[PDB]
Write a protein that binds this ligand. Structure first.
Ligand SMILES: [Ca+2]
Ligand SMILES: [Ca+2]
Ligand SMILES: [Cl-]
Ligand SMILES: [Cl-]
Ligand SMILES: [Cl-]
Ligand code: NA
Ligand code: NA
Ligand code: NA
Ligand code: NA
Ligand code: NA
Ligand code: NA
Ligand code: NA
Ligand code: NA
Ligand code: NA
Ligand code: NA
Ligand code: NA
Ligand code: NA
Ligand code: NI
Length: 482
């Protein structure tokens, strides 16, 4: 049902004394849209290659030459590979493509094995690419792993080897773009966790700050799964909390009021990060949310006490520095480090956005800084899991970008931003940066092989050239907007 299937069939309808039928069929494959799977290509490869090689032998046409010599690349181009199964199935298909019969058939037909989209080339580059893929995924696997070794990795660094220029001819191929999606989905999530761990373990931070960070980690990354080292680290910090930060029992509204306060109070009352509720009759003090609590927090991370930061009638946290650092950020690492370090975790952004926007249009400048940071932050957090150098992130970004106007168009003025101000900040640090110049390089490579076949055939223009150009142009526009 795919491209190769239709081709094998079509070529298996004989008609070789009429080079013109053979050409139409091949030209159709050149422009086909049918996706294929590794097992599918693997089952059809030898027959497909043999039929293409035989097509050139009997018609001597330029289309047949190009097909046979570049079949490996053309077959891989529309490949649908299930990345949950890793590289093995791809390597297994490459083993078939690269087998002795492929060389024997091309040689006997008097054609090359060495085209830029040929079997030798595809075996070498895709093998290398798969090795890079495997290396990219050999980083932290679990939240448990990251907590133990909280390495901070720039999101851009992870898929770096996979989109380097030597792999330019593979870039627009479906399995590559699918693989980029897979790598991003399995690596990016760890950055905010690693960043929060660094704050929890930061000996220059106050005990209360460190305790609250531990709770954000338990809530965002562990839920109900107990990690003993997280457990110990929260307990140590909880035990050292300045008692001045807590509201005295017996004062009005002293009981935890919001879900946040109950969750925090329960963990503090038990010295246990995984306790999130208070059974009735159990006394537990809540953290103060008055302006005086700010002196009990770290100046750069007050928002980590999100209940205080959200209590806008009583307390104004200082978000000017974090908002400044967020604005100045020109990469995912920079902006996410600015957010998380200041206590603007995913959940806190969600809460502070709600709290500030519920007061619009009449916001103070200090409230604007909190709201701006929380609005941009929520958008950054949403995009981060998808972040990468390929088509999937372009699509994920566009989806997010389309929601900004209906969400924020009416509060941007109140937030003190110009028209499109949210998108203008988000684009500065999170805009997709795919190396789409690879698409052009890939086309250049294919046309060099077309031009080689044109010369062997003794022409200066071929239908092959026009079909392939039409195909590549459709892909370039329809996928990348080029
Ligand atoms: Ca699967
Ligand atoms: Ca997302
Ligand atoms: Cl919290
Ligand atoms: Cl998407
Ligand atoms: Cl603009
Ligand atoms: Na998959
Ligand atoms: Na498979
Ligand atoms: Na197998
Ligand atoms: Na080969
Ligand atoms: Na022979
Ligand atoms: Na690091
Ligand atoms: Na300390
Ligand atoms: Na009291
Ligand atoms: Na901090
Ligand atoms: Na105040
Ligand atoms: Na995310
Ligand atoms: Na997605
Ligand atoms: Ni997964």
């Amino acid at each position: 049902p795919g491209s190769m299937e239709a081709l094998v069939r079509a070529l298996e309808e004989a008609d070789h004394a009429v080079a013109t039928v053979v050409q139409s069929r091949i030209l159709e494959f050149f422009m086909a849209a049918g996706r294929e799977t590794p097992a599918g290509v693997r089952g059809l490869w030898a027959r497909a290659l043999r039929l293409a090689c035989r097509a050139y032998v009997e018609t001597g046409t330029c289309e047949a030459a190009v097909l046979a010599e570049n079949l490996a690349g053309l077959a891989l181009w529309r490949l649908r590979h299930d990345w949950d199964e890793g590289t093995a199935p791809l390597l297994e298909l490459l083993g078939v493509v690269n087998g002795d019969d492929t060389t024997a058939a091309l040689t006997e037909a008097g054609l090359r094995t060495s085209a830029e989209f040929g079997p030798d080339a595809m075996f070498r580059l895709v093998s290398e690419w798969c090795a890079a893929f495997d290396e990219a995924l050999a980083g932290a696997r679990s939240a448990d792993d990251v907590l133990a070794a909280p390495r901070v990795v720039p999101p851009e660094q992870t898929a770096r080897a996979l989109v380097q220029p030597r792999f330019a001819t593979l870039y627009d191929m479906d399995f590559v773009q699918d693989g980029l999606r897979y790598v991003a989905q399995h690596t990016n999530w760890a950055l905010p966790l690693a960043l929060a761990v660094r704050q929890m373990q930061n000996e220059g931070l106050k005990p209360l700050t460190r305790a609250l960070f531990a709770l954000t980690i338990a809530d965002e990354f562990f839920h109900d799964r107990q990690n003993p080292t997280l457990r110990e680290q929260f307990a140590e910090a909880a035990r050292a909390v300045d008692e001045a930060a807590l509201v005295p029992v017996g004062e009005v509204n002293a009981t935890p009021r919001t879900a946040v306060e109950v969750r925090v109070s329960a963990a503090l009352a038990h010295g246990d990060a995984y306790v999130r509720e208070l059974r009735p009759g159990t006394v537990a003090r809540r953290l103060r949310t008055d302006q005086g609590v700010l002196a009990l927090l770290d100046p750069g991370a007050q928002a980590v006490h999100v209940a205080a930061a959200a209590d806008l009638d009583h307390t104004q946290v200082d978000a000017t520095g974090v908002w400044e650092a967020v604005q100045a950020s020109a990469s995912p690492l920079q902006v996410v480090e600015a957010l998380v370090t200041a206590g603007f975790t995913r959940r806190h952004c969600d809460l502070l956005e709600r709290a500030v926007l519920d007061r619009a249009p009449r916001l103070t400048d200090a409230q604007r800084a909190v709201g701006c940071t929380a609005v941009v932050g929520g958008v950054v957090h949403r995009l981060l899991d998808d972040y990468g150098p390929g088509l999937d992130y372009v699509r994920a970004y566009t989806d997010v970008a389309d929601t900004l106007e209906p969400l924020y168009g009416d509060v941007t003025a109140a937030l003190g931003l110009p028209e499109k101000g949210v998108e203008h900040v988000v684009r500065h640090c999170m805009a997709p940066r795919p190396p789409t110049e690879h698409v052009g390089a890939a086309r250049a490579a294919l046309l060099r092989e077309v031009a080689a076949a044109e010369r062997r055939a003794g022409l200066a223009h071929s239908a092959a050239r026009e079909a392939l150009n039409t195909w590549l142009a459709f892909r370039a526009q329809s996928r990348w907007g080029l």
